[PDB]
């Protein structure tokens, strides 16, 4: 058949920013999680703690669902909502709308593939008009999020084992595409990018620049 099936990073690929970070940062700011300083040092603290190589990437996700675990999930609700009005919702482009609706209208196959967890990613892929979601996923247990992740999580090589479970879960595989696109900007997803027929260097890093321009994939420097 002649279909195809067209991938999208979230952070930096789609938005100009991360979203993850961001609502920490919301959450801190606003102070839903302790006192507004105490809360950004602790998110920065983190972040400087994996960025320099002293926490795992499952620690790094267990930090940012452990943020969920604190609140109701009717809490949360209430205050994502506010998140995507004022923070997610004026960065979304004209640009990024238009990349993922070329593929919704040319009859892609579309879902957003990202680290991010499903709890803060679930409204931002409908914001697109995506109606597949692939991100690492929060254990929800009796009424609240326990901190933990529930499954694979989305991210690197774990990208990668995500979608052919969610393919397979529809009865479908990434050789039944007459292509499949991925969008993304990191080296961390040259997984998936490699994975796919059309990779694509979204707003790519210096790294995958280098690597993009290296293999012949395309760039494009949406924002």
Same mark, same amino acid.
């Given at each position: ?15 100009? !920013? ?10 801190? $700011? ?7 300083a105490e809360a950004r040092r602790r998110?920065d603290d ?5 960025? $320099? ?22 809490? !949360? ?7 995507? $009005? ?39 892929? $409908? ?80 790294? !995958? ?15």
């Amino acid at each position: 058949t002649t279909r195809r099936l067209a991938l999208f990073d979230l952070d930096h690929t789609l938005l100009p !920013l991360d979203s993850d970070y961001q609502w920490a940062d919301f959450l801190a $700011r606003t102070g839903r999680a302790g006192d507004p300083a105490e809360a950004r040092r602790r998110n920065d603290d983190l972040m400087e703690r994996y960025n $320099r190589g002293e926490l795992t990437a499952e620690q790094a996700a267990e930090f940012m669902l452990g943020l969920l675990a604190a609140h109701s999930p009717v809490e !949360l609700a209430a205050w994502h909502e506010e998140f995507m $009005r004022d923070v997610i919702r004026p960065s979304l482009t004209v640009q990024a709308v238009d990349v993922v609706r070329g593929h919704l209208a040319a009859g892609d196959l579309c879902a957003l593939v990202t680290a991010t967890n499903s709890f803060v990613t679930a409204p931002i892929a $409908r914001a697109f008009g995506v109606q597949h979601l692939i991100a690492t996923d929060p254990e929800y247990r009796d009424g609240r999020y326990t901190g933990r992740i529930e499954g694979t999580p989305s991210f690197r090589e774990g990208k990668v084992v995500r979608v052919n479970q969610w393919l397979a879960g529809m009865g479908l595989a990434l050789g039944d595409f007459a292509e499949s696109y991925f969008y993304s900007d990191s080296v961390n997803d040259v997984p998936l990018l490699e994975a796919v027929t059309r990779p694509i260097a979204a707003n790519p890093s210096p790294g !995958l620049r280098e690597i993009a321009q290296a293999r012949g994939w395309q760039v494009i420097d949406l924002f």
